[PDB]
Amino acid sequence: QISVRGLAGVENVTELKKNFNRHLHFTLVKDRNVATPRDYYFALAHTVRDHLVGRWIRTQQHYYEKDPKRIYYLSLEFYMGRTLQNTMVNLALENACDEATYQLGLDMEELEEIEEDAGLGNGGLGRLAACFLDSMATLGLAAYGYGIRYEFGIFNQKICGGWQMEEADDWLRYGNPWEKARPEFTLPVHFYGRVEHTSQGAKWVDTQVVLAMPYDTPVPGYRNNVVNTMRLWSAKAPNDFNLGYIQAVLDRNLAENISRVLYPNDNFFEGKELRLKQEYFVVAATLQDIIRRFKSSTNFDAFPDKVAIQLNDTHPSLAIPELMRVLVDLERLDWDKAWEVTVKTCAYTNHTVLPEALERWPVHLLETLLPRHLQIIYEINQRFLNRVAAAFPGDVDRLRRMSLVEEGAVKRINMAHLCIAGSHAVNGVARIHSEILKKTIFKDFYELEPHKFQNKTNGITPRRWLVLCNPGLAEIIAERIGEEYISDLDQLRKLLSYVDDEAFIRDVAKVKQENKLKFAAYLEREYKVHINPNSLFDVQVKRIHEYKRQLLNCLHVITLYNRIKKEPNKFVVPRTVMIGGKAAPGYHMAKMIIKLITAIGDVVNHDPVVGDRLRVIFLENYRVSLAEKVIPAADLSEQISTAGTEASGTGNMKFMLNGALTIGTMDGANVEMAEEAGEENFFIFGMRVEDVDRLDQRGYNAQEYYDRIPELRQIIEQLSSGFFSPKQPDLFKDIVNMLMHHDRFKVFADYEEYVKCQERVSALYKNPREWTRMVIRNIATSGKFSSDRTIAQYAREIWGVEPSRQRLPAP
Amino acid sequence: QISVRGLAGVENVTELKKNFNRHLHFTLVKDRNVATPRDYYFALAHTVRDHLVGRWIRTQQHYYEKDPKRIYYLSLEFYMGRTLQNTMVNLALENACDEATYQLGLDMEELEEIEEDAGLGNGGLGRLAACFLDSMATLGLAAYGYGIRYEFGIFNQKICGGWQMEEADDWLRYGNPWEKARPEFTLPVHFYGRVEHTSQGAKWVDTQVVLAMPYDTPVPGYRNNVVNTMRLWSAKAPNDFNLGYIQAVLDRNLAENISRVLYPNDNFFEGKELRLKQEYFVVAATLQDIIRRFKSSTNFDAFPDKVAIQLNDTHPSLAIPELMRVLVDLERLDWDKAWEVTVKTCAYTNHTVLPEALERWPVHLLETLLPRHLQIIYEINQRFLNRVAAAFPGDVDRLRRMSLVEEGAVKRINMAHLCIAGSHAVNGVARIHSEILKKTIFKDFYELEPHKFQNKTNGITPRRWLVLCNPGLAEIIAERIGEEYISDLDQLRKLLSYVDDEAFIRDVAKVKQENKLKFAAYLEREYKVHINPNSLFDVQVKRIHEYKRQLLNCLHVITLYNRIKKEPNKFVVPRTVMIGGKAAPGYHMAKMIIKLITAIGDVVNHDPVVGDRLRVIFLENYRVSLAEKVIPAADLSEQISTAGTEASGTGNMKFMLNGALTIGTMDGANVEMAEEAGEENFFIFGMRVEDVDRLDQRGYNAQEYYDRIPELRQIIEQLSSGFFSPKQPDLFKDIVNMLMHHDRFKVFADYEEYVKCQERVSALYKNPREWTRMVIRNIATSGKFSSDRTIAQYAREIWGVEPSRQRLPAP
Numbered sequence A, B: 001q002i003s004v005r006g007l008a009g010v011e012n013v014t015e016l017k018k019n020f021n022r023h024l025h026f027t028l029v030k031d032r033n034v035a036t037p038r039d040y041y042f043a044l045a046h047t048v049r050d051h052l053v054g055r056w057i058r059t060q061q062h063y064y065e066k067d068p069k070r071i072y073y074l075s076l077e078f079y080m081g082r083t084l085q086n087t088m089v090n091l092a093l094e095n096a097c098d099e100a101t102y103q104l105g106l107d108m109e110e111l112e113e114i115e116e117d118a119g120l121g122n123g124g125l126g127r128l129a130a131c132f133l134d135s136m137a138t139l140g141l142a143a144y145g146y147g148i149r150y151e152f153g154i155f156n157q158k159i160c161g162g163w164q165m166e167e168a169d170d171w172l173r174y175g176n177p178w179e180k181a182r183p184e185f186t187l188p189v190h191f192y193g194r195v196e197h198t199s200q201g202a203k204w205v206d207t208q209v210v211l212a213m214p215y216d217t218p219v220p221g222y223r224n225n226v227v228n229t230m231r232l233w234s235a236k237a238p239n240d241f242n243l244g245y246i247q248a249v250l251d252r253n254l255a256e257n258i259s260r261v262l263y264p265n266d267n268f269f270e271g272k273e274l275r276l277k278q279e280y281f282v283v284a285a286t287l288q289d290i291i292r293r294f295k296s297s298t299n300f301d302a303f304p305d306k307v308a309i310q311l312n313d314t315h316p317s318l319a320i321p322e323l324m325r326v327l328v329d330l331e332r333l334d335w336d337k338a339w340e341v342t343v344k345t346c347a348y349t350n351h352t353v354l355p356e357a358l359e360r361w362p363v364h365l366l367e368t369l370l371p372r373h374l375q376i377i378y379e380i381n382q383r384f385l386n387r388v389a390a391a392f393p394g395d396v397d398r399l400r401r402m403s404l405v406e407e408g409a410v411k412r413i414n415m416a417h418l419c420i421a422g423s424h425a426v427n428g429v430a431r432i433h434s435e436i437l438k439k440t441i442f443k444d445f446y447e448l449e450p451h452k453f454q455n456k457t458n459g460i461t462p463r464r465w466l467v468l469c470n471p472g473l474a475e476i477i478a479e480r481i482g483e484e485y486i487s488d489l490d491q492l493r494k495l496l497s498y499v500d501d502e503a504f505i506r507d508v509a510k511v512k513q514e515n516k517l518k519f520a521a522y523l524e525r526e527y528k529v530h531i532n533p534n535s536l537f538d539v540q541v542k543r544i545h546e547y548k549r550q551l552l553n554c555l556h557v558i559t560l561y562n563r564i565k566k567e568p569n570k571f572v573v574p575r576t577v578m579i580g581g582k583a584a585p586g587y588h589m590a591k592m593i594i595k596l597i598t599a600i601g602d603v604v605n606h607d608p609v610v611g612d613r614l615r616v617i618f619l620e621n622y623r624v625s626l627a628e629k630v631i632p633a634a635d636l637s638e639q640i641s642t643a644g645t646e647a648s649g650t651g652n653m654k655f656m657l658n659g660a661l662t663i664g665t666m667d668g669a670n671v672e673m674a675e676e677a678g679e680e681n682f683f684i685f686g687m688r689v690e691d692v693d694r695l696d697q698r699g700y701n702a703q704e705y706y707d708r709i710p711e712l713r714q715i716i717e718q719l720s721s722g723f724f725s726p727k728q729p730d731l732f733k734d735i736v737n738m739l740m741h742h743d744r745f746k747v748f749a750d751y752e753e754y755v756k757c758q759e760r761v762s763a764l765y766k767n768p769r770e771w772t773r774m775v776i777r778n779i780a781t782s783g784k785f786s787s788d789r790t791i792a793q794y795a796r797e798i799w800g801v802e803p804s805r806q807r808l809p810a811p
């Protein structure tokens, strides 16, 4: 049907049909009379997966023969979403499968909807790991993702009476066709025990053993025949475990709980023993696998030439003392050589500056669980602080600030400090974020070792986030500039030549309208909600957090409602305001914010005077597959975090690529997006980081804003008095109290500028030609935000490897 | 190579080779350079399993179109063993696969050894269910086995310092190719709650819900293209289960524990809540599935014409009140009609007379777990006792004896009484056992309803237990009489014509020698033990129980050792005495018996004066795959239970079919075996049931035997003084004490007769021609003991259906 989806040759279509029927019969044990739509999905999944096998075997064979430097990306989160369409895209099978299924009397898009998301992450950090794997395969790097195979991923969100309810994400229930169990590579992981000192060094003894069983998932590059591996570990009890008899068998669950469930906190640290066990489990199993593969190439001098380990935040920070443990205790290297190898091998990426998100593990936990690692950490700290002392003699406060060991009621280990000491490179994830790291939280470390600090601005893969989710846009672009841009996104700059092209303008606007129509229909069908597709689609989707300021959005929504009620017969640009995102289960304020949003909808959506000029919808169960639907449909992207709080953002980049304009603060990657597009093509408002700092110095007084802004006062009085909760008049008192007395994120301080900026958005939307021309200018300058660019920079500046766009031989 | 293993045609071999290579590549993601022997097993398993698919689909399609009466065999145990060879045998693929793998450079027998036993049973009862499924498929019955898919089957037994250690049987670790998950047929099972009475009857409310997910395993008939289904249920928590957040997800294990592990007690009742939950789980899920299938054919009058439910012991006895519950509470039938339907649908098989093996559930357990079922049971009891009262007016003690409710400290429900009341047929499993049921434990019930009581003597499948495990014997038989005997075992009578045939005599003896050589080699390789293959192979393999009298065997072994030591230079027929079997983990005396056996071996096997004239070996981890190896190798089968205690035995039949002679008491099926073969062709000894009864009446005094038999006195003095445990002189005091003061099974009473009978065995073994002629007379009369005969009798006399030997069309 459309060109970028590849060829549908008669030989291919005939073959796909044959193999689909073979799988339905032999694999699924069904015939067409009893087969359910789920059976059809599986038959198609197996048919497509068959095409990966040869390429996967020969990619891995290739790395063995050429022995390149291998990259190991360690993460506790890989937010993969669905795999079927992505695989078809990367193998150029989409049109062929579409035709083959059509001839079998099936709708492929209907089959695609059956697949469960692999929701093995919370939000931005987990999704970044996924985009990164796609880019590493597309750039021909010998890369492996290593993580945990959670039995339960991020919970499914249900909204009941306007409140979030959590439901277990039992994603493996029907079996996962996109994994291959590798029980032959099962490895032991050790916990507890004690340290014994012998004539020849320390020994870690009397440990409990949990087995780590690997499951491999293929990661196909874009049409280059490369298939890399994501290896995820599952926890298994040994067979002699706890071995009255019945209870011993039932108690195997205690060991196996390690890989049971993903912790649902993003940007918040909870010091629970189970989480610590998860972090060590992935690290211990992975490092053994890395060392085994390296030996199959005695002398660890060449280890850093053949191995790079990337730590995705501090979650796998135990890699540093674990590598030391293996090199010193097991391989018998001297400390200084082991340390040199470790530093040159490891690099660390920081993803946040919020103090409550930093991992600070109580010493007593590490003492019981990982006694040898605590000893190694103490030694690392002593030698590091000896270096600080020599560089800054007499500066005793620097010594306390820089220590890996934090003093207080409970002694804690600062894992970020451990990562900096033990890594040759430390990076932030957007220019402003990386600068903040050097000037504030890690200032002391930057002064000691300035060469370690780098920036690597985040990106997204334009395979999933354009070709897959927005084929209509991909196609109209391809018609003008060809297909090369899909793996060289900078080519989108060529679209600047078409900004005055009447045909292109019409086509861009038409694709958006179609996307909005499709999404308005998705809403009615699956959620029985009725929206006006002619309205401006105003979208804020991301995890619910005070710093992300969904609350500021709420205030604007109520302002618009109040203005309409004040002057009902005045024209306003119609809007559909969509907010979605999950709240961490224990985060009370985030749960209240969801309830507020739905409560506002309850009032606004049923007011006869408003009509269809304003609708407020909460998008339930926001996840990767939902993002793929809503992002192409959006007109306005809300990126409104308080300046200095969103490290990068990546949702922002997705909207830019897909033809929405952005309203945002100068925070995270927004800064670089505005710089790429031109500030005149962006809706910037609000305090800069410097303004926030000024306000903090004299002190933030919310009352001042309340006193000076009558429209703001009205809203607060409506919230307090029970206008949005007539049955429970005091329901939102916690929210009002926080805003008035305890607001870390200065919601009121940006209110006036935000509302004014929103007026300017409405003005532009009244002029479809000019709206669309600004859109073209955004899409045309989105090239920098490809994760291909990001990964090429990691490769050259951190890992010491060259990317390659060259094809591997096919069959 | 050998004829009974089928044809190896060039087309077939070429095709098998192609598909084997396809599976290694696409299914296993391996090539020949990295493939392990386990990979090769799986490639072969998938290749063979592909051949089942068409036959399985069309068998089930056939039953849907013809709508025959369906047979549902409910069991908590299905002791299946390995599946690969059995499938090849039944599909006539053995020689073709042997050739195909040979040409690929592989040894198929080596690949077969990789498969794990499906050890979903304890011993005889579980293995009977397995033989039954094979026979039902071979006889073309529309039969389904229903059970539980235990994550852990019977434990693997390790012997450490002569003591049994238990290890978890993690049989699903590598994945099970012989199952297909059917999550689309998942059903809810209810627990706890309370009963509410409305204007229109009772309602069971406020229940907790566990999901039952079915897994289907094919059961192929012997070369008739029939493939029946064994459906096993797995426990799954609902997604909203317990739904701080982390703990709620981890607590899903509590629901899912229902299908985690097989209870390892055979012939012993333990009233644990988890076991009760297992029993209801299988019953509730199965009955829903049965009813659903029946409705897909309003009026339940025809239910018993279309449905038979066979209860394998009392373990699924809750089927009776569950059927009533559904018919009365959900379908709104009147009580009397529901009861008529229930009785006509259900039949019950009893497998033991030991009082400690009978299920007697405490009322307080049923009250909490299954409140509605307890009410139904009370009502069943009231109406039943009203019938007893009318038949036997004034007989108040009969009323107390026959009640389903037992009085005492704790009120209990007698499940066997429930089964008799609610079934149209009750059978024992050998003639003597069925007679004992009528004369003793169920005498009162037999007097009330004599028509309900039947006998169905047990059998074994001659596919697994001859063709599969003993191809050499199967072949020499086939050479004389053709192949028809494999599904018509009575044809073995034709071998009586060959009892004087010198060629046949030589061939029978040669096959035994080869089997013994192969087993003597298996022992050296896997267990580093050295046995003389010229010795008489004296074998007792079965679960360890006092009633089975492994202890009597021990006494004979020590007698032989003592006699040798007394007259070292006298000739004795050399013996290898092999004992094996698992002890239930909580059965202390059975654990001591294992320790005694190994302790005797420790003395006997290292005494230079004995040489190779006597060896005592404990066979570790006795299970189905081990039985397939040892049984063909045996010369003498030990079946030495106290008369009246072994309901049938089935191991006895296996040895008979495979060319061993039997030393045994007139107990269980031994009686019918001796009757078939002729008592002159059997080594019968010891008390009959009548003699045991006489002894009980005057009282059993072990001291009398000790006082009168000097050889027995010596043995007891050796045990007591520490001759067999020099470091722990008192180790066996518990055993001595039991024998002397508390022996329920009268070990001493049969000692003299046993020893004398063993002398007669040795005498015959000195004459190879006459030994072998008696063997031929045993094999020739083993036909009655085919489970094909057993199932044909169930079919005609209980289920009301005709067996069919006719082929279904192939492809």
Ligand SMILES: OC[C@H]1O[C@@H](NC(=S)N/N=C/c2cccc(Cl)c2)[C@H](O)[C@@H](O)[C@@H]1O
Binding pocket: A049, A050, A052, A053, A175, A176, A177, A178, A179, A180, A181, A182, A216, A217, A218, B026, B027, B028, B029
């Ligand atoms: O279908 C359910 C089961 O599938 C199994 N996969 C098998 S047998 N082959 N895969 C082959 C294959 C081939 C190409 C790509 C990939 Cl990604 C896999 C998995 O090991 C198991 O964990 C899972 O439960």
Ligand SMILES: OC[C@H]1O[C@@H](NC(=S)N/N=C/c2cccc(Cl)c2)[C@H](O)[C@@H](O)[C@@H]1O
Binding pocket: A122, A123, A124, A125, A126, A128, A265, A266, A267, A268, A269, A270, A313, A351, A352, A357, A358, A359, A429, A458, A646, A647, A648, A649, A650, A668
């Ligand atoms: O770099 C990718 C993205 O990373 C996000 N960080 C996230 S989701 N961290 N989760 C941290 C976390 C997660 C679990 C536990 C703990 Cl203790 C911390 C940033 O907020 C976002 O600006 C950026 O675009």
Ligand SMILES: OC[C@H]1O[C@@H](NC(=S)N/N=C/c2cccc(Cl)c2)[C@H](O)[C@@H](O)[C@@H]1O
Binding pocket: A026, A027, A028, A029, B049, B050, B052, B053, B175, B176, B177, B178, B179, B180, B181, B182, B216, B217, B218
């Ligand atoms: O290989 C491991 C997995 O295999 C799956 N089987 C699948 S996908 N097809 N089977 C087809 C089939 C075909 C013929 C006979 C039989 Cl018996 C099965 C099982 O559902 C799953 O529980 C198991 O873990």
Ligand SMILES: OC[C@H]1O[C@@H](NC(=S)N/N=C/c2cccc(Cl)c2)[C@H](O)[C@@H](O)[C@@H]1O
Binding pocket: B122, B123, B124, B125, B126, B128, B265, B266, B267, B268, B269, B270, B313, B351, B352, B357, B358, B359, B429, B458, B646, B647, B648, B649, B650, B668
């Ligand atoms: O009919 C087949 C065989 O059945 C055997 N019975 C066995 S293994 N019962 N287990 C009963 C059992 C098992 C678990 C729990 C409880 Cl509470 C009882 C008989 O002992 C044997 O003579 C006969 O040949």
